[PDB]
Design a protein around this ligand. Structure first.
Ligand SMILES: C[C@]1(c2cc(NC(=O)c3ccc(C#N)cn3)ccc2F)N=C(N)O[C@@H](C(F)(F)F)[C@@H]1F
Ligand code: NA
Ligand code: NA
Length: 371
């Protein structure tokens, strides 16, 4: 408990391609790099020689593979995968010293799913059964780990924005953050859904009915890059960010992520750009706390050309790698709560850093959830 040196620095990534962990499947073990995704619930790995893949799961080499004789077809807004379900032995070499029989979707066909040039071959969905495909009877990886071993029911993520970071399975590592953790209730176990109770742009309230902030949900999602905001909130949010920064001008397409913006090396003026404050529902009645991110988080370098990484959504708020990279994030499934602390690795400057503070008094926080 509190100290897990074998797990520190067990994630890798390339900017905008996500964070992955090394895993092994089958006997003998086949090593695969696997995207860490708290916004889905399937363990799904490349199982056929798609040209984008460095490696793929070869069921025929595994003596412990068991076929479930059942297909799965999974579309998303862009792209899709189809695969064959079964189970096999899975370990995490730089995770707990255990092996579990987990469900695995062996991906046999995909479209716009794998990234050309990336170093990962599958996805580890860490969310709950309610959104597993085909349905909630396909037990997700984390559920199997907890049922079959003594690994405690929690994990935590430190994403460092050549990306790296730490996934601590079964605990928290105190060297990964500073100050205190503050917890927000997981409103329902499907996605890691939470409730945003107030939003401030450089300490000015957007002043919306807070139901707008969670229309139709807000979730914590390591498998998305952007901070995504419901359209109505996104519109209010950039209007207020535009106003805060208008001491300089950007093309308008910029704010829709339709073009990039550039300054010449080491000239980016961060001091014009405002901080963005999200207040999350706290653990106690009428109590919230707030997390504060920097322009360093919402202006992503494209390899000095940044992309605006907040974007409108029709699926609700998505706190992607934009948010998580400032924070150490504890997915405390045993107590149905998500903890945030300042990350000991976040990208910052001389004037400002990311922040997690409380308590604040916020009344009627239950009105903020969408039904
Ligand atoms: C399974 C799924 C998903 C995630 C990624 N994710 C990255 O490719 C990436 C890229 C960069 C970063 C970063 N930083 C993280 N992930 C790619 C394909 C996917 F199919 N997971 C989530 N959460 O979002 C859904 C969606 F992508 F469709 F929106 C989708 F359900
Ligand atoms: Na257990
Ligand atoms: Na600490």
């Amino acid at each position: 408990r509190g100290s897990f040196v074998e797990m520190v620095d067990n994630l890798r990534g390339k900017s905008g391609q996500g964070y992955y962990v090394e895993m092994t499947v089958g006997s003998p073990p086949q090593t695969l790099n696997i995207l860490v995704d708290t916004g889905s619930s399937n363990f799904a790995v490349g199982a056929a020689p798609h040209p984008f893949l460095h490696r793929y799961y070869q069921r025929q080499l595994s003596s412990t593979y068991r076929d479930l004789r059942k297909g799965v077809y999974v579309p998303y807004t862009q792209g899709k995968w189809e695969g064959e379900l079964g189970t096999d032995l899975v370990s995490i070499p730089h995770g707990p010293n255990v092996t579990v029989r987990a469900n695995i979707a062996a991906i046999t066909e995909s479209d716009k799913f794998f990234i050309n040039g990336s170093n990962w071959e599958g996805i580890l969905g860490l969310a709950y059964a309610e959104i597993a495909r085909p349905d909630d009877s396909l037990e997700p990886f984390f559920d199997s780990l907890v049922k079959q071993t003594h690994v405690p029911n929690l994990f935590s993520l430190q994403l460092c924005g050549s990306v790296g970071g730490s996934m601590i399975i079964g605990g928290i590592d105190h060297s990964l953050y500073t100050g205190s953790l503050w917890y927000t209730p997981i409103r329902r176990e499907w996605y890691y859904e939470v409730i945003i109770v107030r939003v401030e742009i450089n300490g000015q309230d957007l002043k919306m009915d807070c139901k707008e902030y969670n229309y139709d949900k807000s979730i914590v999602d390591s498998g998305t890059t952007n901070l995504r905001l419901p359209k109505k909130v996104f519109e209010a949010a950039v209007a207020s960010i535009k106003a805060a920064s208008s001491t300089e001008k950007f093309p308008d397409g910029f704010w829709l992520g339709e073009q990039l913006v550039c300054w010449q090396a080491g000239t980016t003026p961060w001091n014009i750009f405002p901080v963005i404050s999200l207040y999350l529902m706290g653990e106690v009645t009428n109590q919230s706390f707030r997390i504060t991110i920097l322009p360093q988080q919402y202006l992503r370098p494209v390899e000095d050309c940044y992309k605006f990484a907040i974007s409108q959504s029709s699926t609700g708020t998505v706190m992607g790698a934009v948010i998580m990279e400032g924070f150490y994030v504890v997915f405390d499934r045993a107590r149905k709560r998500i903890g945030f602390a300042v990350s000991a690795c976040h990208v910052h400057d001389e004037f400002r850093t990311a922040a997690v503070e409380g308590p604040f008094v916020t009344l009627d926080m239950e009105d903020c959830g969408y039904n």
